[PDB]
Nucleic acid binder design. Structure first.
Ligand SMILES: Nc1nc2c(ncn2[C@@H]2O[C@H](COP(=O)(O)OP(=O)(O)NP(=O)(O)O)[C@@H](O)[C@H]2O)c(=O)[nH]1
Ligand SMILES: [Mg+2]
Ligand SMILES: [Mg+2]
Ligand SMILES: [Mg+2]
Ligand SMILES: [Mg+2]
Ligand SMILES: [Mg+2]
Ligand SMILES: [Mg+2]
Ligand SMILES: [Mg+2]
Ligand SMILES: [Mg+2]
Ligand SMILES: [Mg+2]
Ligand SMILES: [Mg+2]
Ligand SMILES: [Mg+2]
Ligand SMILES: [Mg+2]
Ligand SMILES: [Mg+2]
Ligand SMILES: [Mg+2]
Ligand SMILES: [Mg+2]
Ligand SMILES: [Mg+2]
Ligand SMILES: [Mg+2]
Ligand SMILES: [Mg+2]
Ligand SMILES: [Mg+2]
Lengths: 154, 325, 216
RNA sequence: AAUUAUAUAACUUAUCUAUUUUAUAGUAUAAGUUUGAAAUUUCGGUUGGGGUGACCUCGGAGAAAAUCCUCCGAAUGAUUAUAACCUAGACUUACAAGUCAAAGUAAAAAUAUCUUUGACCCAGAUA
RNA sequence: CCGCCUGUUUACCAAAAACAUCACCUCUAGCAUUACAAGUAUUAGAGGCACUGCCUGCCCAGUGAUCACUUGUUCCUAGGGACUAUGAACGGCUAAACGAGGGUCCAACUGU
RNA sequence: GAGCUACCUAAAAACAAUUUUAUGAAUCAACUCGUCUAUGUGGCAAAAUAGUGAGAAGAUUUUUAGGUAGAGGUGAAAAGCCU
């Protein structure tokens, strides 16, 4: 069954050259330090990762590992890598600046309970703003444009 | 080892969260987000020219719309478009000054009347001085700054914008002396006086790491700020003539630095010097500029500018004080 | 509060924070880290309270050595992390009893609670007070743990029976008219030590010492 | 930490083979790229014990030619009538660096006006 | 009080609460002629950690029910297709037994 | 340089008596170790003596020959041991 889902979402898995597959897998092993079982889980759960180029998957994983304070198990069980970087940064940064999210410190502790990763990304924008952040849709659109300008300067 | 910016945010969350309650997040994100600039024309050489080009850029003068002689162009609500950098005009004067729009509100509320004398107790580079000296028609305006390096900036701005003839005459007078001492020097001299006391500079404090008031070494000065602010406000209150008007301006959101300082100055002046200061209502001010500004009205004395992502023109606190005698 | 079963240990933090709110903080006003101190007479569970809070909020476990004897924690130690979200810190201090114990009865009542090392008050004397209080309160639960039939009011008699139940004997020098002779005897001292232990465990009944003198 | 890193491990291009209609595969080597087993070298100064903050060069001002003595600034710009070359004699000065300047000649037909700092080597840009 | 236990250690100032230890857990590896091993996932290697039983419960789209719509993810252009298909982290203690371990008490005993 | 010591390989050896649920069980020799005290401190000894103690059929102890070598070896990690 795992092959069936992979083939449907990513028909080019067989066609792709050896180098492309090895680089994606090697990034998950050497650079992302995922266990053997997790590599199968990520490939099966989000087949599009193979399409995603290297050095961009690594950035997304490090974004969760360091900036969001997530663990390997959380990343795999929530299909974090499935989502696009733009959606991750827009929603996470909005929550962080609002003060409703906070990085786990060295001790591993957070002063405020962090919203569940399923609430941050999986849910719709309307529910995400209304429930997790309790903001207005207009502000989020303005923030997106403001964030976009900063990336260009970055 | 938290940085100076980290401490500033850490302190603000502890206090401003209580003061502003549910509104602190919206303010918190807005402060961390990029600021919104409002273009102010130089009148003078390009009194018409700059206005036409800015209108093509879709920026609209909020002051002119509010009236519906200071005209400041700002973009529409929620529009993130920036302003092109100011350029030198044919006559040798700069096209416009790009500054925080809310910084110009205290000047607009000072109610300058023609043939008046004005003092800026601490206008280091502030465009407040430029706005006052621009179309104010105030005879013998005076500027004083504690520092000399920032005093240099003020002359730079005046030179670029103010024509020599206006500045050449003693009608503009720049000084570098203690503001509190200034009260004794010139008592009951000036009709209108603007006092912008040193403030915690919340937005700049978070963004800028260097010369941040929240640094550990400068803790002594940071704690002493409320005392110093009261002294400067009292000195200006002494300087203003009988029946004069003064406005106390502060950038921070702290209740200690906004409401207590003004009332403390009134109480100190009422007792030691036996002078009564009666505040002037500014509620109508909120109604006029609500389009281009959002204000937290609960404040007993003064008007506070709250930064929101829709209108990121904060943070500013300004209270108008009229000397009854 | 009960610290072995972690009962009512959630309510402490909300109340503790509420008190700090109403009060002032002055020098530490800007610090987001809350530190508080636990003090009391020895063997009251000060060190237990620290661990019990640590696991109810921080969920890490035991951080202060806990013992069944008075005077285990010797000095004011460094800070120990106890909570995370409020972030309160607890300081642990050695138990301090008193310079003077007011009434001697006040000192007996504390000896029964384990606050006083029974060896500088006398096991036998403490045992008599325990029997005296246990009989008045009607909690005749020591006549079933130890078979005592009708019960009694003489400490020597009850101590005799319990020593028999536990099959304990000593060689004790008794002083008689013709000289000194070592005679095998039932162990009254060991009986008193064990009799107090069962009281401390709680199997002899629920007792409120202050019920009689200070009912208020 | 700085400098390296054919230890391994990957890759890419050559080279060499086979095949192949240009493709594949491989590879006694060379050149790269990624990892780092290792290798080499270092621990400025002023700071009761520390922790911490700081400070290290020069200019302005008081004490008055001392100080862990007390203050303000600078690593400037603005302003322009654009401010040459050559040459007595002096200042200051460990050295190095830094100042003032008659005469003569030459441009023009009043100087620039406000009031500072980085050597050598070595790299740049040009006619 | 500490360590499960028998063991081990600083030859020559530390024998211990340290190390090891059964048990439990994590990670790596699908394979042969010199170790692992003449072995093959119930195996082997690397490492962590008292076990035992008892608790807590991160978590695993929603809404109408094997089922319909909104989501989610991708594309084609805000429209249109394509596709979803028990248990983490932890704890309080088997609870005994054992010890030239570290504290304490009673009895006896005594030139301390 | 592994005739000491650390670990390993090969070939060998020793363990009385007394109890026991039959064993990294118990008591206690030989044997191995080295707890505590006194003596000794150029000593009998460059780590001993005298008592007192721990284990003593086992992860025990011991003998012979071989092996691993300093950018290293060995280590039930004391950064311990390798004349
Ligand atoms: N039954 C019961 N026993 C408790 C409770 N709390 C503590 N104990 C018992 O008390 C002892 C622990 O006390 P402890 O925490 O050391 O107290 P302390 O005051 O901090 N010790 P010290 O005398 O050294 O200052 C243990 O015997 C423990 O079982 C409780 O709530 N109930
Ligand atoms: Mg010289
Ligand atoms: Mg001349
Ligand atoms: Mg042991
Ligand atoms: Mg042992
Ligand atoms: Mg030994
Ligand atoms: Mg030794
Ligand atoms: Mg021992
Ligand atoms: Mg020893
Ligand atoms: Mg251990
Ligand atoms: Mg021992
Ligand atoms: Mg005795
Ligand atoms: Mg040998
Ligand atoms: Mg035998
Ligand atoms: Mg045995
Ligand atoms: Mg023995
Ligand atoms: Mg034994
Ligand atoms: Mg060994
Ligand atoms: Mg060690
Ligand atoms: Mg060590």
């Amino acid at each position: 069954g795992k092959l069936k889902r992979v083939l449907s979402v990513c028909p080019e898995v067989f066609t792709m050259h050896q180098r492309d597959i090895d680089r994606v897998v090697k990034v998950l092993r050497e650079k992302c330090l995922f266990t053997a079982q997790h590599i199968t889980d990520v490939l099966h759960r989000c087949p599009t990762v193979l399409q995603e180029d290297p050095n961009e998957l690594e950035y997304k994983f490090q974004y969760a590992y360091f900036r969001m304070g997530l663990t390997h198990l959380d990343i795999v069980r929530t299909n974090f890598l499935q989502y696009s970087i733009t959606k991750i940064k827009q929603r996470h940064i909005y929550l962080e600046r609002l003060g409703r999210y906070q990085t786990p410190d060295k001790k591993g502790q957070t002063q405020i309970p962090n919203p569940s990763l399923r609430n941050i990304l999986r849910v719709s924008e309307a529910e995400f703003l209304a429930r997790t952040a309790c903001s207005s849709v207009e502000e989020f659109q303005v923030f997106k444009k403001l964030l976009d300008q900063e990336e260009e300067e970055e | 080892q938290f940085t100076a910016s980290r401490l500033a945010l850490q302190n603000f969350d502890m206090t401003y969260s209580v003061q502003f309650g549910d509104l602190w997040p919206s303010i918190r994100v807005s402060l961390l987000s990029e600021q919104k600039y409002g273009a102010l024309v130089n009148n003078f050489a390009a009194w018409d020219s700059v206005s036409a080009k800015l209108e093509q850029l879709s920026a609209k003068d909020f002051v002119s719309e509010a009236i519906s002689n200071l005209r400041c162009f700002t973009f529409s609500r929620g529009d993130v478009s920036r302003f092109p950098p100011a350029r030198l005009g044919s006559l040798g004067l700069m096209d416009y000054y790009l500054m925080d729009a809310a910084s110009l509100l205290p000047v607009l509320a000072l109610g300058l009347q023609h043939g008046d004398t004005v003092l800026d107790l601490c206008a280091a580079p502030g465009g407040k001085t430029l706005a006052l000296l621009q179309t104010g028609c105030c005879r013998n305006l005076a500027a004083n700054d504690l520092s000399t390096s920032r005093t240099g900036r003020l002359q730079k701005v005046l030179h670029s914008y103010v024509p020599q003839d206006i500045r050449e005459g003693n009608q503009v007078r720049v000084t570098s002396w203690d503001g509190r001492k200034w009260g004794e020097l010139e008592g009951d001299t000036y009709d209108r006086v603007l006092v912008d006391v040193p403030c915690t500079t919340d937005r700049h404090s978070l963004h800028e790491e260097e010369n941040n008031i929240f640094q550990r070494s400068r803790k002594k000065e940071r704690q002493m700020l409320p005392m110093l602010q009261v002294q400067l406000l009292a000195a200006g209150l002494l300087a203003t003539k009988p029946g004069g008007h003064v406005v106390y301006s502060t950038c921070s959101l702290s209740h200690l630095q906004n409401e207590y300082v003004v009332q403390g100055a009134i109480e100190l002046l009422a007792n030691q010097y036996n002078i009564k200061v009666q505040v002037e209502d500014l509620s109508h001010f909120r109604k006029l500029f609500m389009d281009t500004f959002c204000f937290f009205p609960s404040c007993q004395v003064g008007e506070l500018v709250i930064p929101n992502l829709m209108v990121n023109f904060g943070p500013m606190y300004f209270c108008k004080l009229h000397r009854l005698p | 509060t009960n610290c072995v079963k972690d009962e009512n240990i959630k309510q402490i933090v909300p109340k503790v924070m509420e008190l700090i709110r109403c009060s002032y903080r002055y020098h530490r006003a800007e610090t987001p880290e809350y530190c508080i101190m636990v003090v009391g007479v020895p063997n009251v569970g000060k060190s237990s309270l620290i661990n019990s809070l640590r696991r109810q909020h921080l969920r890490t476990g035991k951080a202060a050595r806990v013992g069944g004897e008075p005077g285990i924690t010797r000095a004011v130690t460094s800070r120990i992390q106890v909570c995370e979200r409020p972030l309160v810190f607890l300081l642990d201090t050695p138990g301090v009893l008193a310079p003077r114990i007011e009434s001697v009865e006040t000192g007996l009542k504390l000896a029964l609670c384990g606050t006083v090392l029974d060896h500088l008050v006398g096991e036998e004397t403490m045992a008599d007070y325990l029997l005296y209080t246990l009989n008045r309160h009607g909690l005749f639960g020591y006549v079933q743990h130890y078979a005592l039939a009708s019960a009694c009011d003489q400490i020597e008699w009850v101590l005799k029976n319990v020593a028999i139940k536990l099959r304990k004997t000593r060689k004790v020098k008794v002083l008689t008219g013709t000289g000194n002779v070592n005679v095998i005897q039932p162990d009254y001292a060991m009986a008193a030590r064990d009799f107090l232990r069962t009281f401390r465990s709680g199997l002899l009944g629920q007792v409120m010492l202050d019920r009689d003198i200070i009912p208020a």
